[PDB]
Design a binder for these strands. Sequence first.
DNA 1: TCCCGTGAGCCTCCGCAGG
DNA 2: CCTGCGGAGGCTCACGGGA
Length: 914
Amino acid sequence: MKRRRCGVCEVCQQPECGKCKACKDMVKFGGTGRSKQACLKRRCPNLAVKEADDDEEADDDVSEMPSPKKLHQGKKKKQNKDRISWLGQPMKIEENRTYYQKVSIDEEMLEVGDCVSVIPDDSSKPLYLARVTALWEDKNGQMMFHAHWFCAGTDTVLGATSDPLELFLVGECENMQLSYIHSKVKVIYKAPSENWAMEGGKTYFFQLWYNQEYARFESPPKTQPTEDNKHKFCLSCIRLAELRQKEMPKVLEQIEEVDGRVYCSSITKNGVVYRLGDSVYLPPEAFTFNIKVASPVKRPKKDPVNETLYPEHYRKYSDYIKGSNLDAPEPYRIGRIKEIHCGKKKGKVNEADIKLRLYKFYRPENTHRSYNGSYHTDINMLYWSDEEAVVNFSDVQGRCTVEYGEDLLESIQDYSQGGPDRFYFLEAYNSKTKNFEDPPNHARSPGNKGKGLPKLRTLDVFSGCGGLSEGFHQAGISETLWAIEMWDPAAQAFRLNNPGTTVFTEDCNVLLKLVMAGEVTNSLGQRLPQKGDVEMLCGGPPCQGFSGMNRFNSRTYSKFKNSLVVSFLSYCDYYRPRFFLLENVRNFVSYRRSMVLKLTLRCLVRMGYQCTFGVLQAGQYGVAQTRRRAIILAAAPGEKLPLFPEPLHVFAPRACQLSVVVDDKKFVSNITRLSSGPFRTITVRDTMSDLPEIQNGASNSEIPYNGEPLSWFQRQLRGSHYQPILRDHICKDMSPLVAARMRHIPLFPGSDWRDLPNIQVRLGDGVIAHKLQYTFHDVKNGYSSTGALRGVCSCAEGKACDPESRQFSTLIPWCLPHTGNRHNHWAGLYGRLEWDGFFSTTVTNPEPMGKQGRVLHPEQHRVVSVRECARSQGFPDSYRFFGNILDRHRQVGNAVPPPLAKAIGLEIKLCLLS
DNA sequence: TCCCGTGAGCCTCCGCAGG
DNA sequence: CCTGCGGAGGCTCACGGGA
Ligand SMILES: Nc1ncnc2c1ncn2[C@@H]1O[C@H](CSCC[C@H](N)C(=O)O)[C@@H](O)[C@H]1O
Ligand SMILES: [Zn+2]
Ligand SMILES: [Zn+2]
Ligand SMILES: [Zn+2]
Ligand SMILES: [Zn+2]
């Protein structure tokens, strides 16, 4: 695969001279041009594959309504039927109605189980189609039936790409006078073959069930008739029934009655069961803290920045600071349920009025110590208080576990790592004496005195260095036996981290065409994967080939049929894994007006897979980086389609638009934690504060950790086993000019190129970087506060660009103010990360002047080291990379953050323990 | 009436041949 | 060294609807 040049670096930007043997031989310079080489001074050191594409926040507010019910639009054209007679004897007689099985309508016979068409109010709409689930005459002498609605492909995400003859069962059903029926249409159920896995290479039919709100296609439910519903069995009804019984609060144990308030010991809601002494997740507003908090003082008056020293500082119009947790919500409040008591209504217990007497729990950042006092603490560690509060059981977000430190029968770390939602506390807090005594005898569970599953054979395609696999492995559901990675450094790094797996360094296409042609091994004698071998197929196909937003055309769609994603599906089609995971950039879901997404789903469903899609933000799963990825899940017919993970960390609301619009329809994932979460957001401080200080160019690929972990995050990434060596703490050697610039960016949050001094600097190069000169008037931007010009080209005056107007070796890059107006003032370029913020999407090659160019260390005068990047993703420091400093950066930036891959991994685990 | 996004087609120069 | 060539990725400009 052929590499190329970056557009950003100081090398590239330098224009052509005409002094070279090549510059002299160029066609434009009159040369024959047989040379075909660039300027000698324009050989970009950063030369590497820019076979990548950043993703913009293209989605709007999505301030729009959830999808209304499909067939639930009422308005159904009633027909006129002359004669409607029952047939045979009644199946069953109830108190209020009488059920039959057969009915004849205008000489036409129908039966329960038959499928009928119906006519919609609107003429445009395609006929409704449904299954008759019961027949009966009512008290009012009316002859009725119950319809279980189908749903046409075109009504789903699939849209027009659906097979016209395909319908999908849906959770919608209503009652109707038989006379609404138009015709009876035949509908076949295309169930999966006995040998489904092995088949790689004019009637209405259905195979799957469609959840509109979540865009999930799943295998028809297995629920079975009871004694009471045999004569009238409808899946849509039961589904809804079981939903409600789960959704609504009930109660399981009552202790006593008192003062018109029954006291309870055990209540349930939404599938979770709460008992006295259990702990609970609540919203931030559920209760305040009885701790005197002094409202901070209004910031001092800042002396107007010198416009002549900081010309381009005006361009910093008040703007949302990129990588700022000033928007971060607070995490769930936590408390221990002390008492439960419900009200009463109609002489009965009123389950809609359950309240909780709770012991407030302090998060370390909740004490007076504030954040500055919780930097080094376990994110799951709590401080007990005796401060109480009463809460409505309707506000409870979930159960969690909070255990006394010492009380635990294992290691604290063992405990935390043991399962989800596990907190612990060691001391207790006194909001009054602001002291830290230890837990009262009633917080503990009275005890003895003293003080302390088969794995899926996975085939990972476009594996890269194996971020994804790493996360899966962590979840313990996979054993990667084969990996395909066309790029040789990535492939090696993968081998380095997985001695058990066979990495094929080839184009997935030929590798596939090999095993299809009945080949057993590639030219290197590596055993090829055979049907039955692969249980899970995960991959990250690049879509750079056709990453377009406009509509498909003739030969643009051809570029697709030959894409890598289509190869991925040919793998899925051939191997027929139990599971299938495609991960991509967030934009995967809207490329080509979402034909990419629609077409892949269409493919999966064609094969007969259960499948869904969603967008996830990595920050929410334990990483100090903005990273939204699209995700497709698929599951063999016999399986359970997994769900999406539930956010673990609170994260900036702007970085979290997870909803997606396809054909003006709004889809979301099962994700419930919209804003808050169990844990605090991970910061740049949390990420890389323990790292030694390094200079620009630091190439030492082995240095010691001069210090211990200073973060929960770090203790997780460095493990507990003694390891004194710090690998890959190395950053790119930036031009002396660029190094000077980085030195002159302030340290405060919000710093970037716009904060640069317009001064003259003697570099450690001998060359001198000059002042930039403003010799044109900028009609849009006006004047300095002192009437100084702000334009650097004839184009700032509306006139045509003068090429001689360009300026070189200047501290403020001439090109920036030159285009800043039409590009948002390049917010972020030469920008520094901030200790309390987060990485903008980790990049494959750190350029202060690339598009995603906020990449300077918070304090040190340099770009971020390879480790700092590996750290902004989820890589354990143990994880090994391979190649020159550039190769490594690219591998890190390309990879799925293990924390995210793990989160998904665990969701899949739940489908094997089914 | 324009504006935004092209994407077919010309422009560039990377990786490697072979003298 | 050098000479030079394929071929693929980039950048351009005329052209199409989306409203
Ligand atoms: N034609 C091809 N065949 C095999 N691999 C390819 C390929 N084209 C690109 N790739 C590789 O596919 C990878 C996609 S980035 C995905 C990385 C991976 N999911 C992780 O978590 O680490 C890149 O590393 C790229 O080198
Ligand atoms: Zn460059
Ligand atoms: Zn030159
Ligand atoms: Zn029903
Ligand atoms: Zn200009």
